[PDB]
Design a protein around this ligand. Sequence first.
Ligand SMILES: CNS(=O)(=O)c1cccc(C)c1F
Ligand SMILES: CNS(=O)(=O)c1cccc(C)c1F
Ligand code: NA
Ligand code: NA
Lengths: 330, 330
Amino acid sequence: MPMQMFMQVYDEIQMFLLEELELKFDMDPNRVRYLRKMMDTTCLGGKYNRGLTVIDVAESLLSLSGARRKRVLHDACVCGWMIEFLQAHYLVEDDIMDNSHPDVTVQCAINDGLLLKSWTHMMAMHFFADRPFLQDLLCRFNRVDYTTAVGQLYDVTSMFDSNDFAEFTLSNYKRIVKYKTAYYTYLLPLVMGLIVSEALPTVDMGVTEELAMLMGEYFQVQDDVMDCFTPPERLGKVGTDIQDAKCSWLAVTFLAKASSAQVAEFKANYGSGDSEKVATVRRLYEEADLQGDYVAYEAAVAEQVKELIEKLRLCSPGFAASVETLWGKT
Amino acid sequence: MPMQMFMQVYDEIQMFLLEELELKFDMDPNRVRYLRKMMDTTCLGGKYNRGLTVIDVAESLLSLSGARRKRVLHDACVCGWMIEFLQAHYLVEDDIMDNSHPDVTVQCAINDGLLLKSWTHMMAMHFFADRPFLQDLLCRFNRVDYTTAVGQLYDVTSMFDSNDFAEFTLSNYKRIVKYKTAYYTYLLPLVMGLIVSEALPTVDMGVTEELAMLMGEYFQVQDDVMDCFTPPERLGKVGTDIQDAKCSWLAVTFLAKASSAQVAEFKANYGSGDSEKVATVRRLYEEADLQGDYVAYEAAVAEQVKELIEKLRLCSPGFAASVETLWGKT
Ligand SMILES: CNS(=O)(=O)c1cccc(C)c1F
Ligand SMILES: CNS(=O)(=O)c1cccc(C)c1F
Ligand code: NA
Ligand code: NA
């Protein structure tokens, strides 16, 4: 039912956006069908975990506060697609960075990214035109864009000096995870579920933001390990954190328990595309028993998650049930 | 005074944004100074015509409706910088398309473009937090982004078939100018001047949008001609409309008054980077007496502008005076 309702609202949102382009933006049918195909290609096919979370939080809050039910669930679907469309946007953005007479393909790719971003605003300004939370919803969506852009600056410049392994620390790793993933992957769907449920002031934002920290930290540590050791066919992509010299969990944990000679060998091989240099970094990670610390680190973070849900349970019981479901997905 | 007040508010907006990053976004001083330099580099140095227009419209409307004066003029400066910051954003975006081990310069350039875009929202959500027009201002700013993105799709795909000179017409040229330049360059500063002056419903939006059409059309026709004939040192850049096969005013006007043999020669040379092929296109433009039609076309459009200002004068006299000043700049 939640997935079935989520897909029906997609056709409703798609038909509005495309008809609006045809009726108000003077768009020819060729470009309309081109945009329908590009919208289906970039927005569909995922798991919709962050779009379905908005629905699960909304339905968990109407069970413990007829016509208002259909409105909140429909608003939560439009909100869920704002998140999926936003993720569809960055999916195309994650291709412009590793792809390179004007090139029309690069021009169309940049344009697709701009359209996917604008569609989130257009669907919100339409379906929420008479909602009292429209202004607050647009403001919180601008803040998550700023947070993500700031998180990218931290992630990209973690090995240089913005006009180098000094920033390869555990607190700076948390800072990157906080602004690049945690606030984006987990806080955004939960907060918007509270907005459409009119139960935003009924929850502790500090406890909610802290839950997103640990859940985003748990997920990013797992991603960093899989990016290094999981083979490409089983991971779904080619792990390149070592070649790109990313400030990963494996890097900052290794630099803490390694000898001076091992750090010198790490610094000499980290950040290169050579096959044996990357293999040298994997050997240094293996010999340092990092996968033993990975189990203890993930268990300790999970312990903090299971206990923080109960603090939020005391004031918002229905909200905590939906956070337990999202936490199960990670 | 208007330029002096506009620059003081810049330091106020810059200091808020940077201190906010330091105090709320956990940014180190190295990256703060890096962002101050990048903000100064991308946002300053222009002519500020579209930022100063907001001030001129605001001051022309308070003269014909103490504490409210200082508020409206300050709000108009923040609004003016939202436009200049937005233009600063596309200045960096106009470099990613013609510029191309992760490349850190391309990553920083994409990040700069995202930050410049987010800064427009952050300065609006801060200085207009208690203004009743904050929601309407954010909505109109989302629509101009959609309009610009749609205008780029029309401009980029004017010679292909979105999954070819058929779209090389005068009405389609106006469609491109409308969404890519007219609504962006001229309607945006005027409307925001009306917002901060609380005089939005007091004007005819249809007459106002129509004025932006003709003024944007007048300016784009002049740009298309200068891009072709004005030498690089006098133009300020290297004109490349012929090589990029742009749907320019010269192209659609030539195709209407040319013979079949001249159109065949045009189609054989248009859209190539060869020196003599581009020179062949310039010769075809010269021999067709296009610069004689350019004078008549610009005069006819200017006649429609001078007469449309008087229709708007009948209901909004102060608004028309500021539109006459902006029209003088073009
Ligand atoms: C305090 N919450 S917020 O600023 O509205 C917000 C919500 C969701 C995600 C982010 C990054 C965010 F900043
Ligand atoms: C009707 N006006 S609008 O939609 O708010 C608007 C204002 C300025 C520029 C653009 C493109 C725009 F669409
Ligand atoms: Na998702
Ligand atoms: Na300007």
